[PDB]
C-alpha cells in the first residue's frame, strides 16, 4: 500500500503526523522520512529523532531520493 518501488516516496506530511531524521544518514537537517518508510534496521547505532509536522512546518518524505541520504536506504514498505 505504501510501497513506492522505483521512485521516491514524496508523501506530504499532514498536521500532527510523525516524521524521522537521522544525524548520520541525512545530508542536512531537512532530510526526513515518514513512518511507513523509516526502517530501524537502517539506523541501528545512529542518532534518530522523531518530530511532528506542525502548522508552521511543511514538506515531504525523502525515502528513495538518493540526494537526501549519505547511505542507501532500505524502505520498510518493501518488507513483507
Amino acid at each position: 500500500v505504501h510501497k513506492h518501488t522505483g521512485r521516491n516516496c514524496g508523501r506530504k506530511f499532514k498536521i500532527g503526523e510523525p516524521l524521522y531524521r537521522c544525524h548520520e544518514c541525512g545530508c542536512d537537517d531537512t532530510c526526513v522520512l515518514c513512518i511507513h518508510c523509516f526502517n530501524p534496521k537502517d539506523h541501528v547505532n545512529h542518532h534518530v529523532c522523531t518530530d511532528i509536522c506542525t502548522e508552521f512546518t511543511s514538506g515531504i518524505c525523502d525515502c528513495g531520493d538518493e540526494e537526501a541520504w549519505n547511505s542507501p536506504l532500505h524502505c520498510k514498505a518493501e518488507e513483507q
Binding site: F13, L19, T30, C31, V32, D51, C53, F56, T57, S58, G59, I60, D62, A68
Partner: peptide, 4 residues
C-alpha cells in the same frame, strides 16, 4: 524535505 521538510521546511517552511
Amino acid at each position: 524535505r521538510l521546511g517552511e
